[PDB]
From Swiss-Prot, chain B:
It is an enzyme of class 3 (hydrolase). Component of the 20S core proteasome complex involved in the proteolytic degradation of most intracellular proteins. This complex plays numerous essential roles within the cell by associating with different regulatory particles. Associated with two 19S regulatory particles, forms the 26S proteasome and thus participates in the ATP-dependent degradation of ubiquitinated proteins. The chain holds residues 44 to 263 of 277 of the full protein. It is found in: Cytoplasm; Nucleus. GO terms for biological process: proteasome-mediated ubiquitin-dependent protein catabolic process. It catalyses: Cleavage of peptide bonds with very broad specificity. One of its GO terms (molecular function) is threonine-type endopeptidase activity. This is Proteasome subunit beta type-7. Its EC number is 3.4.25.1. The 26S proteasome consists of a 20S proteasome core and two 19S regulatory subunits. The 20S proteasome core is a barrel-shaped complex made of 28 subunits that are arranged in four stacked rings. The two outer rings are each formed by seven alpha subunits, and the two inner rings are formed by seven beta subunits. The proteolytic activity is exerted by three beta-subunits PSMB5, PSMB6 and PSMB7. Expressed at a low level in colonic mucosa. Up-regulated in colorectal cancer tissues. Its main location: cytoplasm.
UniProtKB/Swiss-Prot annotation, chain C:
The keyword Nucleus applies. It is linked to Neurodevelopmental disorder with microcephaly, hypotonia, and absent language: An autosomal recessive disorder characterized by microcephaly, intellectual disability with absent speech, severe developmental delay, short stature, and hypotonia. Affected individuals also manifest aggressive behavior and have hearing loss. InterPro entries: Ntn_hydrolases_N (IPR029055), Proteasome_bsu_CS (IPR016050), Proteasome_sua/b (IPR001353), Proteasome_suB-type (IPR023333). GO terms for cellular component: cytoplasm; cytosol; extracellular exosome; extracellular region; ficolin-1-rich granule lumen; nucleoplasm; nucleus; proteasome complex. Glycans are attached at S30, S181. Non-catalytic component of the 20S core proteasome complex involved in the proteolytic degradation of most intracellular proteins. This complex plays numerous essential roles within the cell by associating with different regulatory particles. Associated with two 19S regulatory particles, forms the 26S proteasome and thus participates in the ATP-dependent degradation of ubiquitinated proteins. It is found in: Cytoplasm; Nucleus. Gene3D superfamilies: Glutamine Phosphoribosylpyrophosphate, subunit 1, domain 1. Keywords: Acetylation, Cytoplasm, Deafness, Glycoprotein, Host-virus interaction, Intellectual disability, Nucleus, Phosphoprotein, Proteasome. The keyword Ribosomal protein does not apply. This is Proteasome subunit beta type-1. The modification N6-acetyllysine is found at K176.
From Swiss-Prot, chain D:
PROSITE patterns: PROTEASOME_ALPHA_1, PROTEASOME_ALPHA_2. The keyword Acetylation applies. The modification Phosphoserine is found at S107, S174. Component of the 20S core proteasome complex involved in the proteolytic degradation of most intracellular proteins. This complex plays numerous essential roles within the cell by associating with different regulatory particles. Associated with two 19S regulatory particles, forms the 26S proteasome and thus participates in the ATP-dependent degradation of ubiquitinated proteins. It comes from Homo sapiens (Human). The gene is PSMA1. GO terms for molecular function: lipopolysaccharide binding. This is Proteasome subunit alpha type-1.
Swiss-Prot record, chain H:
The 26S proteasome consists of a 20S proteasome core and two 19S regulatory subunits. The 20S proteasome core is a barrel-shaped complex made of 28 subunits that are arranged in four stacked rings. The two outer rings are each formed by seven alpha subunits, and the two inner rings are formed by seven beta subunits. The proteolytic activity is exerted by three beta-subunits PSMB5, PSMB6 and PSMB7. Forms a ternary complex with SMAD1 and OAZ1 before PSMB4 is incorporated into the 20S proteasome. Interacts with PRPF19. (Microbial infection) Interacts with HTLV-1 Tax protein. Its main location: cytoplasm. The modification Phosphotyrosine is found at Y57. Non-catalytic component of the 20S core proteasome complex involved in the proteolytic degradation of most intracellular proteins. This complex plays numerous essential roles within the cell by associating with different regulatory particles. Associated with two 19S regulatory particles, forms the 26S proteasome and thus participates in the ATP-dependent degradation of ubiquitinated proteins. It comes from Homo sapiens. This is Proteasome subunit beta type-4. Disulfide bonds: none annotated. Belongs to the peptidase T1B family.
Amino acid sequence: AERGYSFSLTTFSPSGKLVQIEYALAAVAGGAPSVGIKAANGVVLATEKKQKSILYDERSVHKVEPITKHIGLVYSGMGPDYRVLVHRARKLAQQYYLVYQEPIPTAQLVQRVASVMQEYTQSGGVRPFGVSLLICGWNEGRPYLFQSDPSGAYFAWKATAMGKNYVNGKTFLEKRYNEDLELEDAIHTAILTLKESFEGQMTEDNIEVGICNEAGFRRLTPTEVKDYLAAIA
Amino acid sequence: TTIAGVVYKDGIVLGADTRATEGMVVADKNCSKIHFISPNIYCCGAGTAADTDMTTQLISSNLELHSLSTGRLPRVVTANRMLKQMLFRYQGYIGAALVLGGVDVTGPHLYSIYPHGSTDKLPYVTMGSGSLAAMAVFEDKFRPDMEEEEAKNLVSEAIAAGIFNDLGSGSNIDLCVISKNKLDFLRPYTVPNKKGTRLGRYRCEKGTTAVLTEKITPLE
Amino acid sequence: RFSPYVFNGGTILAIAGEDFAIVASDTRLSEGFSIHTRDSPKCYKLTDKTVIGCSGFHGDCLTLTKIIEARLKMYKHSNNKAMTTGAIAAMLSTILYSRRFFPYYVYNIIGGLDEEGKGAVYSFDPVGSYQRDSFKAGGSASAMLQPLLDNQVGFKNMQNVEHVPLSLDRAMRLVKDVFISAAERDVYTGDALRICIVTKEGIREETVSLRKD
Amino acid sequence: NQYDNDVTVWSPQGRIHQIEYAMEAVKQGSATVGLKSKTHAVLVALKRAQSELAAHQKKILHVDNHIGISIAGLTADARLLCNFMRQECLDSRFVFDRPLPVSRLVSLIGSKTQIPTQRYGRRPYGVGLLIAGYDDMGPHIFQTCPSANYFDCRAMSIGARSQSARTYLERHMSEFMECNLNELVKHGLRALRETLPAEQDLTTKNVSIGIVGKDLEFTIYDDDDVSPFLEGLEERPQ
Amino acid sequence: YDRGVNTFSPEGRLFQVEYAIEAIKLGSTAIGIQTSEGVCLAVEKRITSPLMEPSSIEKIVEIDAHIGCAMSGLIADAKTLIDKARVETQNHWFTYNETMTVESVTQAVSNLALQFGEEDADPGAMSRPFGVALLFGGVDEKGPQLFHMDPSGTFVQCDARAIGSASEGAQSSLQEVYHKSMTLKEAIKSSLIILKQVMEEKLNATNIELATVQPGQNFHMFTKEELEEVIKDI
Amino acid sequence: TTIMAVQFDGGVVLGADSRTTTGSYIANRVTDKLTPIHDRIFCCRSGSAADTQAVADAVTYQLGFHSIELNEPPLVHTAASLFKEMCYRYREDLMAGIIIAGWDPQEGGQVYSVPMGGMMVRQSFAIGGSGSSYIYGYVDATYREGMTKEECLQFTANALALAMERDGSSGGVIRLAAIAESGVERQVLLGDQIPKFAVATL
Amino acid sequence: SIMSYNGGAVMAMKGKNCVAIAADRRFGIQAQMVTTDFQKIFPMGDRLYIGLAGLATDVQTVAQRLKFRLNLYELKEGRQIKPYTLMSMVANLLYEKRFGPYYTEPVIAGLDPKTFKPFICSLDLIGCPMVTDDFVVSGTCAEQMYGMCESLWEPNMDPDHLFETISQAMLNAVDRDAVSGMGVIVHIIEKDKITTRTLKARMD
Amino acid sequence: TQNPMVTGTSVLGVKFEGGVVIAADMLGSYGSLARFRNISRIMRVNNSTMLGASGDYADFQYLKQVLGQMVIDEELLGDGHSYSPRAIHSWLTRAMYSRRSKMNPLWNTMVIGGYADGESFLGYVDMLGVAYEAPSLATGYGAYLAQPLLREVLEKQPVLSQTEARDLVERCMRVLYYRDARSYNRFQIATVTEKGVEIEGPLSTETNWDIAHMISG
Amino acid sequence: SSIGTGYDLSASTFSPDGRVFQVEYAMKAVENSSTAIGIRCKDGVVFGVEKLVLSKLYEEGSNKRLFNVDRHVGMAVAGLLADARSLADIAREEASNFRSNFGYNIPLKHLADRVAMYVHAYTLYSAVRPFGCSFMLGSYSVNDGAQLYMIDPSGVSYGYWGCAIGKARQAAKTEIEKLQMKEMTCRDIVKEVAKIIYIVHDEVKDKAFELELSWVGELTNGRHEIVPKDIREEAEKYAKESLKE
């Protein structure tokens, strides 16, 4: 038999800190790095999908997941938590669609998912998610790129990085990237900022990329990623 | 309402009329009765309109979730199961009569689904007030393994039979063709029905309506 | 459809004297036009000072009887004493009213002694309305028994007749007479008659034969 | 000291300290004894008074016409269990119209009392019971512990200084099965007596007796209704 | 170090119950005397200021016309039990049309004994024992009765009993002066005497309360004048 | 509807018509009323189509989980008991007449009837549905202990043909299925394959 | 019938780059008129109105709960609501009471707040949506309104002609219905302005 | 059960010296259709009691299941205690009344027979919870046809032998086969003695049809 | 093999070396219990229990550690007794429900799996404590054979030819492995059971004791029964005499 712990596992320290949230953030800043770039006509998400053996079938689990037909996700931190959040986000999107018969705006999805994340920092018997999310979307002509952290807070980015070495990736982005970039150039600089960390030979199966233009979100084929990883195309 | 479905060599042809009646008065001359379920699965709806709408939308949503999780294209059996179990749970109080058709990895599949939750898997089905006429057309001119245009012709013929012989049906004909590698959402197929041209001009000229009160509100 | 009630017949009588209480009933259990049994009395000894008669739907009679027993035991456990007759009457009232919207089809008459040793009769309706009486008949032949008892015990409509209190002997022969007349006119009343006498000595039971048709 | 405060916590040596501490609550109560013949079952209990101006604690409770109990420990838990037993007996008479078999009532007590010795924030019943009964298998004396364990006894005693009574009873077991009622109650009273210093002894003020048998419903005797039993005992001198 | 409210001491007792017993030892002392002529209950009010209206201090209340109750310890906790007792008597009257025996009422209130706990309970259940001792004084078929109850739930009949801070002394004093044939006057007199002995303030008409229950008379709380007539005979 | 099941030595034989009507209209003239519950356990349905389909699915689910959890071929009596439980518990809300039949290594070929009430009884042969009424006599005068498999096949075929001829709620095609340790042998009798009987003339 | 208990009529009509919505003004209980200024058309944002006919209570209630959800929408999102979206919202709201429905048959008329493309629709009492390119009607005089609208409506009409058309349709349809009328009100809305008029009508 | 489906008709019972006999045909009728002509409507409930049921057969199977489980549960203990016939009768009464009071009755009329402690037991339980004891019992049309015969005998010779009782039962079943259109010429007889419960297999009733040739005169 | 730094206060807590110490402590409570053995042969299963008597005041057959779970299923326990009884009630209910739902007597392996899942359910949460008992289930059928299973506080369930639990587990097992039970009959087995019990008993530390014996096999038509006083005393005599060598 079982019931549930009804008290908060996340509490204020005398300094005024929510320690478990910051430890969760520590868990995020220890995971494989991910980059997101908003580029006028589209959005790019990319991440290090580096396995630990040749035995791993990289064609089975993905880090770049679709939420709907126009919204995509990547993460930094713990996998299983991310998976939970993905299911939940998809469900939320579909509820929205059932009520409004209109594809969910990216910002609204971000807000709802963020609310779910906030619940796990105050509700009883649970720890916060050890995951930061990057959410890309196409709605109302414009492109959109958000990030949501374990506290349940979210921010809109033109470009950003999370995970290991996210600070240097962030600076690299601040210098070697700006607006008026086509999605192609954005993919280029995205693989470029991921390469600022990817210890080893960065192959077409070592990273995963997803795009979001006004034709829908999709994961890039390994072939397309190879062509991009030819330092060209 | 007259809806029909047939199984041909390369897939499935769905057909529907476009009249929506409230009582014995036509409300809609161009009602869409062919609903999206999944990219490979479509559903014609007769019975209580709101119920077919919500049922079909709900199942579409759940199936999108399902395929999103599985990463594969939905199966028709899945749609059939979801629909029939939901409908059985409500004991006929949800007035959804459906023609469900699609193409799978296992091929083309056509089910008819009744509001109580019973289903039938058949090469050709009809539902609605005009279903007996359409069924007559099928039972007279159906052969297995037809070609696309032949099947389209047969279905449009059945829907027409319904249109001209049932007071519940009328207006245009919608077809939806689903094959192993094509989706022809023809809407509408062919309108065998037209309002006669206006003989008169009953146009009222400005000032002919007396006004007691006016109030103009500027916007932005 | 389905009816949860059936009339099982039965007549019931109770008389209160200065130092005694009589609770009598026939022994016929019937349904429709048939006899279920000829040996089914409607009297139930509750305490050593209290007897209850239950007539009507037999299922409810049984159920109600067992409920009363259980609750007597409970009052004893809870208060280290037995229930007085009045207490049983009141408790019965509440038990009957708890089913106000799905009643026990039972006419109850309690007969016994109060705490002064005097005879006490309580009559009930199926939902627990109850009063105290000198004498009361309930059941199928109630309308046959009541007016005679109003005459021979209440001296109603009798001019220049002494108002002598009812003796046990006379009461007994009265009960026997009214049940004998009722067995003649009521098709539900017959087979046998059980009488329960309640005095300080305890509870006597007498059985008289009635006609079997 | 970290395996002390919760019933859901095993000790590293295979024990549960809350259960044992609960068992200790039985010993804090005044002693009681129970024995059976082949026809009768008798509880004898040493009542107990706070001050002289206070009456002596009830020790024997009536459950059903054929079943009575003697309590030792927390009185609230005792009344709780008593109500449970009464209700079960009533249920049995209601449904089957036959008295509830003693061993089954006891089994039910075991089941009920085991439950809170496994759930967090719950505590064991802090009371020991001696149960006297009579059914189709004759007289019965049962013993129930806070550990939710139970025993079918030929005779028993529980409470403070009850080891003495236990010894005496253990001596005269072979006599009991053929004793008459007076002799049985006598033996019970002697067993209860050995649980006292030489200064104090039995009285019509601090003794309760409970009897049930083949010709007798469960009955409780105290005050002056105990006198016929006591006035027939050997003034055991130091 | 925090443990459950239902934890046993190695001695075999509940910590909370024992601590509640301790909590009683701070309460105003109260005296009850049982007598074939009636039962008397007396208690000190313990006024802590001349600004406090003493008539708003009731440590003796009527449970019913034939049962009174004197309380010691945490009065706030006592109010609940008093109300529950009254409701109980009224329900018994409603159901059976006869008054409750004092022992039955006492038992009823005692049923709320160890009805506290954390897990496996209603969201409106008690978290801790009642920190209060009670003295029920009544008249029924068994005559004048007096019962005592403590947070353990154990209730017992008593001929003369004292509860409160000066419990031991007052009880000894009671023992020295009680016999099962006193008059009600001797009982009241004795009570007021011992009370004056144990009270820290000077005994007067607006400093204690006194109530009697006699076989011929319903529960009566003594007025100021009625108190004066008794205190006169010190 | 006319359903039928006959038990023989090595197993059972199932038969059903194929007509499903809504009023006097035939919504399906080619219905499959023999429904696999397990590898060697079938059910014949009759009554509300929705009800029987739902119940059959539920039983198939339960029995599947059960058989996996026991790691044994499930008993026919077990499937029958599951049907019995559902059909009895919801007797006021279901309109179903079921015949559970199949083979089982422990008790061999068996046929159970679960009629509208929710009772369960094993029978040598069982008939059900609207049409059954018309073939009680025939089936009583034609049955014989110790029929072969093919004999039972011809038997059910004939009975069903007669019922379909007389009952308006029955007709279409005949569906047969033999079940034994060997496996499941399904066949379909249509048109002229369906047994005919000399019709009265002058 | 329940819908005929209070009566009333609501109509919407498409124009060029404009749209119109009209309603009678009568609030009555069966045969008896109580008031002649009953509001049946409610603003759900700039250039987006909803018309509710049927049981007066549910008219008011549906309007109010709709404003509730709509305000929440316009707060969570930083935008006025699109017409299709409002239609789906109302549909959802009505279907929530599928087995105990509000007795109203709403009519929506508005311009796309981003573009200017006119939109009209009507719904069941249980929220089955229906969009047309010409007109929609709801009320106790539905057949009448259909009769008028089928004969008067032209495709690409300018504001003045849309006005005259919807006004004549409403007036002549309502004047053949006993429980509709006591005045007519018309909102004709275009990109730049909104014109609100009350028509000269019979009061019987 | 609101609408009974497959049903069984009359059940007979009579006490005799040191035992009880119960009779019931093996027919389950679907309305007027003699649908299931080989079902038992008599259950052995432990060694000292037995039960016969009229009414809905499905509900009888349910009661048979529940009772069976109760008996097994009890015999698991082996505490030298067993349900007396009167106890089973009491329980059944409580059950039927409970279902009746939930407006969801068990459509049965039952006869419980037993032998324990040197005494014969015969109890009747209704679907409404009407219960009683009698030296003879007959459900349904037996209450109109068999019971007058049984009572006629038992009020001229209260104590019957097993043979007299069996003969009486056969005659009554014969009368029922003559006058009850929902009976069957194939029945069971169950007997309780101190030796236990015996259920004798399919018995037929001999019939006479000479009155077929008394048309004209 | 002994870490107690808060890592052993709850069943919802792993030790840093990947252990759940509460379950181990419950197991230890089983180890401190009197020994009970069960052995399966070719025509059934036999149970034997060393029931330590704590007082001569207790009646013969008090605190039985042999249970009737179903009419075809017997149960032998070792450890905290009340827990054992509760688990017996659970087993009984599981068997009953199985019969009600499926119509036939529950297969032993299935009953085992079910009760064992129930036991395992108590090793996951802080809200409840693991069962301080291990138990054996015995059964016989012609369609399944003779079967004997054992379940420990962790929820583990295995099938055995011979098994033992309590104080003298390993010693008892060593005594058991000398038997060729796959060829012997329950009759021959009873004596050997009683024998092994009398061997394994420690008369020095533990005082007097009482021997419990249980049949379940072809000799009993599948019904789990108590060993008759006759066969019991025979086996006891055989044991006492075999003890002098």
